Design a protein around this nucleic acid. Structure first.
Lengths: 98, 48, 136, 50
RNA sequence: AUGUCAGCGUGU
DNA sequence: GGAAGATCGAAAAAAGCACACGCTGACCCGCGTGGTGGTG
DNA sequence: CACCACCACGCGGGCGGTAGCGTGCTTTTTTCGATCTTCC
């Protein structure tokens, strides 16, 4: 009646309650529109994590062609990830006190 | 826990609907398939 | 104009979707590798698709819309890189058509020599993804 | 006033706008828009005013 | 030794 | 004199919609593939 | 020994289709593009 189980997720997935229940806690915490978060979550647009010395900043959403162009031109150290793991890395990188 | 999502015998050889069990089975199927795709080094057009 | 897309067809309905798409003047391509399979006879000559539930489609989006293709009998869905469906270069599919038994040609030979279909389709998808990345 | 508000200026533009309304995301093509508008109200197999 | 859906009805 | 803050109106999405009881039916994967098995 | 019949079954998903499916409620919150205005 009491013992619970667990499944080890192979890839991170967003918790729907925090993502969808308006106002979105993920969006409010990261100051990003719900459309951008929901489109980077379901694998349709890349999002930057480490802006680096390139022109693009930290929290920028990029389409496929934009990401490929950035990798062609400034393809040295900038990080542009895809999906829920990208959002998890973005949340981890951000510091709360500053 | 299983007791909070029980499988009810239907005294006819079949069982009840068990909605939570169905959703859990769906999630387990997807997780196992994703693991299989990842361990085969599948391209980023399919694992996505 | 003319392009190439990838279609994941319904399980076990590859030939039905193939003939339905041929009826619609869409150029359907599915590799058919002939090898030896373990059957009641030892290593009988069997022709098998490179991997089931996958087919390349050549059709002009203006001539035939994608909604019609998605509604074609025997096909399940498209394969899209992002929101828009993926576009396959003509060079790679032409090379695949040319190299029936066998850099890129080494990749085709490696794909053909593997006897595990679940790995065959993953290797082929890796090759086509590499070619798409090189093209774009 | 409705014409002033209306952004379309040609038959193809109006058909494209209607298709964009009906099927979001799908690329509005001439053939697709024409087929959709023809089948909406002027096809016996889809529309039946008894 | 359930659940759900649909319908009917009773008392307010 | 053009970008940013204010407005604002419409479109969309979510949340809710009394209690208690009685009775009835109807249902509770799939499906097409591959493996297996008796057979004349 | 192919040969037809029978059962596991497995992964699979929206379903079936050569597309759409929806159409008689009210209130609250968001949000997002269009206007404006206004101000540095």
């Amino acid at each position: 009646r009491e013992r619970m189980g667990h499944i080890e997720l192979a890839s991170p997935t967003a918790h729907i309650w925090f993502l969808k229940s308006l106002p979105s806690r993920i969006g409010l915490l990261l100051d990003m529109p719900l459309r951008d978060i929901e489109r980077v979550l379901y694998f349709e647009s890349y999002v930057v994590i480490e802006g680096g010395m390139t022109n693009l900043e930290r929290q920028q959403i990029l389409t496929e062609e934009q990401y490929l162009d950035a990798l062609e031109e400034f393809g040295d150290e900038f990080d542009a990830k895809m999906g829920a793991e990208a959002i998890q890395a973005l949340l981890k990188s951000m510091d709360l006190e500053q | 826990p299983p007791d909070l999502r029980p499988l009810v015998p239907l005294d006819g050889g079949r069982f009840a609907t068990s909605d939570l069990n169905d959703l859990y089975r769906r999630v387990i199927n997807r997780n196992n398939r994703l693991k299989r795709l990842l361990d085969l080094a599948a391209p980023d057009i399919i694992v996505r | 104009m003319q392009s190439w897309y990838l279609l994941y067809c319904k399980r076990g309905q590859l030939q039905r979707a193939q003939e339905h798409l041929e009826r619609q003047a869409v150029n359907c391509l599915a590799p058919m590798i002939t090898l030896e399979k373990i059957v009641r006879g030892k290593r009988t000559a069997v022709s098998e698709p490179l991997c089931p539930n996958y087919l390349f489609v050549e059709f002009d989006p203006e001539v035939i819309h994608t909604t019609t293709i998605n509604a074609t009998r025997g096909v399940s869905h498209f394969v899209r890189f992002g929101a828009s469906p993926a576009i396959v270069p003509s060079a790679v599919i032409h090379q695949l058509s040319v190299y029936k038994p066998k850099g890129a040609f080494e990749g085709f030979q490696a794909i053909f020599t593997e006897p595990d279909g679940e790995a065959r389709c993953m290797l082929l998808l890796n090759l086509i993804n590499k070619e798409i990345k090189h093209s774009v | 006033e409705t014409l002033r508000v209306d952004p379309t200026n040609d038959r193809l533009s109006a058909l494209v706008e209607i298709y964009r309304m009906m099927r979001p995301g799908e690329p509005p093509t001439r053939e697709a828009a024409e087929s959709l508008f023809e089948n909406l109200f002027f096809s016996e197999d889809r529309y039946d005013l008894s």
